[PDB]
Amino acid sequence: VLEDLKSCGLF
Amino acid sequence: MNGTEGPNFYVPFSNKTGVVRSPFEAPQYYLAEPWQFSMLAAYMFLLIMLGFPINFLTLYVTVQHKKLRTPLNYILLNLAVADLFMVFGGFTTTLYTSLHGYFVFGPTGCNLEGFFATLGGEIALWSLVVLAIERYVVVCKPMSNFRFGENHAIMGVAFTWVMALACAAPPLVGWSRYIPEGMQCSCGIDYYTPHEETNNESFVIYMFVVHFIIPLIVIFFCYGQLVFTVKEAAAQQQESATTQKAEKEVTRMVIIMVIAFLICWLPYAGVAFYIFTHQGSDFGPIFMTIPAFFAKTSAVYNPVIYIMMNKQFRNCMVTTLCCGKN
Ligand SMILES: *[C@@H]1O[C@H](CO)[C@@H](O[C@@H]2O[C@H](CO)[C@@H](O[C@@H]3O[C@H](CO)[C@@H](O)[C@H](O)[C@@H]3O[C@@H]3O[C@H](CO)[C@@H](O)[C@H](O)[C@@H]3O)[C@H](O)[C@H]2NC(C)=O)[C@H](O)[C@H]1NC(C)=O
Ligand SMILES: *[C@@H]1O[C@H](CO)[C@@H](O)[C@H](O[C@@H]2O[C@H](CO)[C@@H](O)[C@H](O)[C@H]2NC(C)=O)[C@H]1NC(C)=O
Ligand SMILES: CCCCCCCCCO[C@@H]1O[C@H](CO)[C@@H](O)[C@H](O)[C@H]1O
Ligand SMILES: CCCCCCCCCO[C@@H]1O[C@H](CO)[C@@H](O)[C@H](O)[C@H]1O
Ligand SMILES: *C(=O)CCCCCCCCCCCCCCC
């Protein structure tokens, strides 16, 4: 889930 | 009766003393002291001096850093442009008119200023909605075998434009109207006078439902699902310290975004709802400016939250502002 979060600028 | 009516205006001041003037013709120094108009100008100046650099810089670093030009970032650029519509459509014009003590640009300028300021605010609003939807789709993956690409990002941006026009354009053609608000130096939607000739009542209801309730429901649902998804992933992977950090940080950001949204729109929604429920009541010029204060200042704190607190944008901004230094 981390790469999707990074892709969204959330983490 | 607390107000003075005119063909394209409503001054929130009684004309029983004969001192009230058209807000398109003469200073409104009877509904507020001159120094209060100066403080209106001062605040507009503050919003320009903070709002323009932060939003223009967002566009500027995107031109210089190619890693920022990703489909998921399109809606953030859309936000930045929207805020600039608020800065030049509204803030600069209000700076100028407040220094005169009235809306010197007349009824035509009132529609112009009203349209672009409202347009800017609504594009920003629906950008925040689209952003939530996109983030929900990408992270929670409600659709199997779906990949968010450039075309989806373009549709999302176009959607905000259409929704914003669905709000900003009707007052130009007879559904509600633009008139000076509060201290009569800026123009906006008439959500407080019973003007049946433009059917104000129905438009305010339409606004409340479509452009407040629906965005609120969507943002809450999407970010609620997102928090649940990340909470669940972390629970199923407690051996990963990074996944635990992610869950904490995401929950924090979702709270910040939800609260910021409410701070921006709940005053306007609250005041409108009150006037709607309590029609036949006195509302001061300074009182009407309060919901405008919260809504307009979003041109500064939204890019702080959505751009500056975004690690990718923040790093690129720091690099740009510090001449190549990391
Ligand atoms: C708030 O109330 C005030 C006072 O009631 C409003 O101002 C008044 O507006 C009228 C016009 O609607 C002004 O009429 C003029 O009166 C002066 C008297 O000193 C004089 O110049 C004229 O009589 C003039 O009327 C016109 O005169 C020409 C002259 O050729 C004639 O041809 C016209 O037919 C017509 O008679 C009056 O002075 C104003 N009074 C004050 C104190 O300003 C004001 O409009 C109200 N505010 C709002 C927003 O409606
Ligand atoms: C105009 O504003 C004055 C205050 O200066 C106010 O007295 C008038 O009457 C108000 O009407 C309301 C309608 O129900 C009522 O709820 C309220 O209590 C009443 N104000 C007072 C002090 O009794 C206002 N009139 C209008 C038509 O707005
Ligand atoms: C109103 C807000 C809308 C903002 C949209 C700005 C998009 C800017 C990025 O363009 C894209 O850059 C990529 C890398 O250079 C190219 O691969 C791609 O083909 C091109 O389309
Ligand atoms: C939203 C629920 C309540 C609806 C009734 C109030 C609508 C009128 C408020 O106008 C607002 O004025 C701001 C400053 O000009 C703009 O930034 C914003 O875009 C615009 O919407
Ligand atoms: C390349 O390395 C450029 C370095 C820039 C350093 C600038 C530091 C000072 C910025 C402060 C700006 C304050 C302005 C206040 C105006 C009211």
Cβ contacts of residue B50 below 8 Å, gap of 6+? B300
Instruction: Give the Cβ contact number of residue B237 at 10 Å.
Output: 14
Going by DSSP bridges, is the β-strand pair B4-6/B186-189 parallel, antiparallel, or unpaired?
Answer: unpaired
CB-nearest to B233 from A1, A9, A10 is A1
Region for B103 from its dihedrals, namely left if φ exceeds 0, alpha if ψ lies in -120 to 50, beta otherwise: beta
What DSSP character marks residue B325? -
How far, in Å, is the centroid of ligand 4 from the Cα of B212?
Answer: 10
C-alpha–C-alpha distance, residues B111 and B213, integer Å: 26
Q: Please list every residue in chain B whose beta carbon sits closer than 8 Å to the beta carbon of residue A9.
A: 72-73, 76, 310-313
Q: Where are the beta strands (DSSP E) in chain B?
A: 4-6, 9-11, 178-181, 186-189
Q: Closest Cα to atom 15, ligand 5: which residue? A: B49
Q: How far is CA B17 from CA B2, B5, B305, in A?
A: 12, 15, 48
Q: B68 near B316, Cβ under 8 Å?
A: yes
Q: What resolution in angstrom units was achieved for this structure?
A: 2.3
What domains appear along chain B, each with residue ranges and CATH number?
Answer: 1-326 (1.20.1070.10)
Cβ contacts of residue B208 below 8 Å, gap of 6+? B269, B272, B273
C-alpha–C-alpha distance, residues B45 and B84, integer Å: 14
Q: Which residue, among B122, B53, B43, B129, has the nearest Cα to B308 in the 3D structure?
A: B53
Here the tokens at position B72 are 């998921």
Handedness of CA B189, B262, B294, B287 (dihedral sign): positive
Residue whose token pair is 């900003």: B168
- Asked if residue B25 belongs to a known ligand binding site, the reply is no
How far, in Å, is the centroid of ligand 2 from the Cα of B283?
Answer: 10
Q: B180 near B103, Cβ under 8 Å?
A: yes
Distance from CA of B103 to the nearest CA of A (A): 41
Q: Which residue, among B192, B214, B179, has the nearest Cα to B24 in the 3D structure?
A: B179
Instruction: Give the Cβ contact number of residue B19 at 10 Å.
Output: 13
C-alpha–C-alpha distance, residues B88 and B52, integer Å: 9
Here the tokens at position B276 are 């709607």
* Structure-solving method: X-ray
Q: B254 near B131, Cβ under 8 Å?
A: no
C-alpha–C-alpha distance, residues B90 and B217, integer Å: 28
- Please state the φ and ψ torsions of residue B148, each to the nearest 5 degrees: -70, 120
Q: Which helix (H) or strand (E) holds B253?
A: helix B241-277
How far does Cα B308 stand from its chain's mean position? 18
Q: Please list every residue in chain A whose beta carbon sits closer than 8 Å to the beta carbon of residue B139.
A: 1, 4-5, 8, 10
C-alpha–C-alpha distance, residues B256 and B259, integer Å: 5
Strand partners, B179: B188
What DSSP character marks residue B9? E
Q: Which helix (H) or strand (E) holds B214?
A: helix B214-235
